[PDB]
Amino acid sequence: PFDLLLLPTWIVPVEPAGVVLRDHALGIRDGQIALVAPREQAMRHGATEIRELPGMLLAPGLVNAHGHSAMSLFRGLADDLPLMTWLQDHIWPAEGQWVSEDFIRDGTELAIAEQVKGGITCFSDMYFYPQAICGVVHDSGVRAQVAIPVLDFPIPGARDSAEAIRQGMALFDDLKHHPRIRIAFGPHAPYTVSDDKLEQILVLTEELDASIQMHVHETAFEVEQAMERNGERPLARLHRLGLLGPRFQAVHMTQVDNDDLAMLVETNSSVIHCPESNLKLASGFCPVEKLWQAGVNVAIGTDGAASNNDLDLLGETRTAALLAKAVYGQATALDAHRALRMATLNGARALGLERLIGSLEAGKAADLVAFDLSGLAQQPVYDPVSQLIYASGRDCVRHVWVGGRQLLDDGRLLRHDEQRLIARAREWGAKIAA
């Protein structure tokens, strides 16, 4: 007998690809997808609780594969700037000044609350005070990869990388048996981490079976600079140092030559596409369809709210689906089904969670999002997945579960106090603004 039976108009399981189930039901038990079946059959099975969801599309929860969640408190603080001046003259100085453990707890919770409301059940974070990030994640009920920030210089909470790594080990330790949080390593970028630190990270990840997330090939200037100073592209450097592989998550990759493509194919590394951030900083255009056609796993992320500036993964996914057609020069590139897969299954693959989350298969965790497609602007619906990708906003998100626990009920966050978070964000904004 199920704990919960959901009866939506449409289910999109993502696996197998391209299909939509009409008048079916999904049964949840013990925090897992126990059955997907026609309604008659599923109803005959019975459940503690039943929820009809007419006009709704039920999908795997969205996976935001790259972000810096507490930068939510810097939303819109630094517009109109290309990458290097954005970092050096605005963001880094503001991080040195403001970012404490209290900043991180408030900013992360604000970010989570925003993400759950837009259907995101799993997220990747690359930001300071990971220990604090995990406490907030733990309380929220959502799933996360938390990457340990490794940089060649002092950062908030870590005078240097050895301290960041040592704090990282303590964290790996504690969370060994957490159902929802995975620790990973977060070397920032090629130009802010040495060969030595990169090797220590590799060995640690061999030893711990952990992931690596890094900004790679964000800008032409990063690549040309690396070519002129070291005579090798930053990706070949990473390949030479042995970091590439199925647990390596290369974020951005707007600069991809044919050697780059060959390396990603060979090693089976994931690329995390951040289209809006790459547009906003004038970083370039990640060649998504090309990567996809070559078999590279391509997930999607929002990046931070100072270079987006929302945490809307559904919106990011639409932007990616539109952009990819014109970048590639074919209207058939990254169709709605594949765009949804990028937002779900490919994120789970990128984070090493494909066996737990990312599709609606029996036995997987019940990380689910229900989207409402009954609104005036979504009519008429010829294809619900098309309507999701190209004509629905994140405000259509009604319900969200993680591991079968409901975190959003008819648009209301069950584990957060929006009114308190807003008052808190506001307090932060006035102190940072003054």
State the minimum distance, in angstroms, from the CB of residue 68 to its own copies.
15
Per CB under 8 A, contacts with its own copies among 325-354 are: 325-326, 328-333, 335-336
Closer by beta carbon to its own copies, 181 or else 300:
300
- Burial of 79 by CB count in 10 Å (0-12 exposed, 13-18 middle, 19+ buried)? exposed
Task: List the one residue from 308, 344, 346, 387 that touches Zn ion (CB under 5 A).
Answer: 308
Residue 154, CB-side half-sphere exposure with 13 Å CA sphere: 6
- Per CB under 5 A, which region of 40-48, 52-60, 259-267, 310-318 contacts Zn ion? 310-318
Edge-first strand listing for the sheet containing 270-273: 62-64, 120-126, 143-150, 181-187, 212-216, 248-252, 270-273, 297-300
User: Helix, strand, coil % (nearest 5) of the chain?
Assistant: 45, 25, 35
Per CB under 5 A, contacts with Zn ion among 247-306 are: 276, 303
Q: Which residue has the tokens 């300071």?
A: 128
* Total residues interacting with Zn ion, rule: CB under 5 A: 6
CA distance 15 to 341: 9
Per CB under 6 A, contacts with ligand MCF among 202-241 are: 215, 218
Closer by beta carbon to Zn ion, 140 or else 308:
308
By CB under 6 A, is residue 149 in contact with ligand MCF? yes
Task: List the one residue from 223, 263, 381, 397 that touches its own copies (CB under 8 A).
Answer: 381
Q: Which residue has the tokens 């009809």?
A: 52
CA distance 319 to 317: 5
- Per CB under 6 A, which region of 169-177, 186-194, 228-236, 314-322 contacts ligand MCF? 186-194
Task: List the one residue from 81, 120, 151, 402 that touches its own copies (CB under 8 A).
Answer: 81
Task: Take residue 34 and report the two structure tokens written for it.
Answer: 């126990």
Q: 392: helix, coil or strand? A: coil
- Per CB under 8 A, which region of 142-150, 202-210, 229-237, 417-425 contacts its own copies? 417-425
Length of the chain: 434
Task: List the one residue from 114, 125, 218, 260 that touches its own copies (CB under 8 A).
Answer: 114
CA distance 157 to 159: 7
Q: Provide the 8-state DSSP code for 426.
A: H
Tell me the per-residue interface mask from 337 to 376 with ligand MCF, x by CB under 6 A, - otherwise. ----------------------------------------
Binding residues: 66, 68, 215, 276, 303, 308, 310, 316
Annotated binding-site residues for Mg(2+) read 276, 308, 310, 316
Q: Which residues make up the interface to Zn ion (CB under 5 A)?
A: 276, 303, 308, 310, 312, 315
